[PDB]
UniProtKB/Swiss-Prot annotation, chain A:
It comes from the Eukaryota. It is a single-pass type II membrane protein. One of its GO terms (molecular function) is carbohydrate binding. Strongly expressed in peripheral blood leukocytes and spleen, with weaker expression in lymph node and adult liver, and no expression detected in bone marrow, thymus, and fetal liver. Not expressed in brain, heart, placenta, lung, kidney, skeletal muscle, and pancreas. Within peripheral blood leukocyte and immunocyte cell lines, expression was predominant in NK cells but was also detected in monocytes. The lineage of its organism: Eukaryota, Metazoa, Chordata, Craniata, Vertebrata. Disulfide bonds join 32-119, 98-111. This is Killer cell lectin-like receptor subfamily F member 1. GO terms for biological process: cell surface receptor signaling pathway; innate immune response; NK T cell activation. The gene is KLRF1. Homodimer. Interacts with CLEC2B. Keywords: Disulfide bond, Glycoprotein, Immunity, Innate immunity, Lectin, Membrane, Phosphoprotein, Receptor, Signal-anchor, Transmembrane, Transmembrane helix.
Length: 122, 123
């Protein structure tokens, strides 16, 4: 009894929007921000499961994770750095590296490549 | 009586941040949004004046205006379309056209070019 914006999915008191269009990580992020939400932050394994049920493999999907290179680790859009236990990222940790889900792995891709994305809010 | 974030300028109840770094219009917009603000919306001529006082000319500066091409007009980031009376824009009205101030004129540029920008928020 706390309603999601119409056409969003509700899961554990968060609301999710999975895109059909594709865009740069920045453009995706703008999309979410303008809609009072952010790119998807995965809190735990069970949430990972939920995301995976709503995703085609063979499709890079931007998530709210990127390579800072101030603290020189990957941080979520939260500002919390990634748990190297829970998550492993395949690919280079350069600047202008952003994370995407593909085949149930997280990949480093360049921020300017144009993928589907997921929005999330609480 | 209501204070601006440190190192922002106050003018008529709005706060302005003028960048030193440069980035794409989208990247700039993200920068503003993350800071609970938006790219600069010019309300009137007097505000135009204020902006111009704080800009070195011969420098493109992204502003919060772009070419929709759903309503097929320029709209501010507000969502209000351009007043062809108050403002004139030099340059093509293609998709992926965003507005930038240079030399106190507004130019259409492509969204991917990498300029200084201004953030703004109200009170
Ligand atoms: C990466 O993450 C933050 C959001 O946490 C964003 O401010 C920053 O601009 C991002 N980098 C790129 C290359 O877009
Ligand atoms: C242009 O304007 C809107 C702001 O309301 C924003 O959705 C959009 O991402 C920007 N689009 C372009 C052309 O970059």
């Amino acid at each position: 009894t706390v309603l999601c914006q119409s056409e969003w999915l509700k899961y554990q008191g968060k609301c999710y929007w999975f895109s059909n269009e594709m865009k740069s990580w920045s453009d995706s992020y703008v999309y979410c921000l303008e809609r009072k939400s952010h790119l998807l932050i995965i809190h735990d394994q069970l949430e990972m499961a939920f995301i995976q049920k709503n995703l085609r493999q063979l499709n890079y999907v931007w998530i709210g994770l990127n390579f800072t290179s101030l603290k020189m680790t990957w941080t979520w859009v939260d500002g919390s750095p990634i748990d190297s236990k829970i998550f492993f990222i395949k690919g280079p940790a350069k600047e202008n590296s952003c994370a995407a889900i593909k085949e149930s792995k997280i990949f480093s891709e360049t921020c300017s490549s144009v993928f589907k994305w997921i929005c999330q809010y609480g």
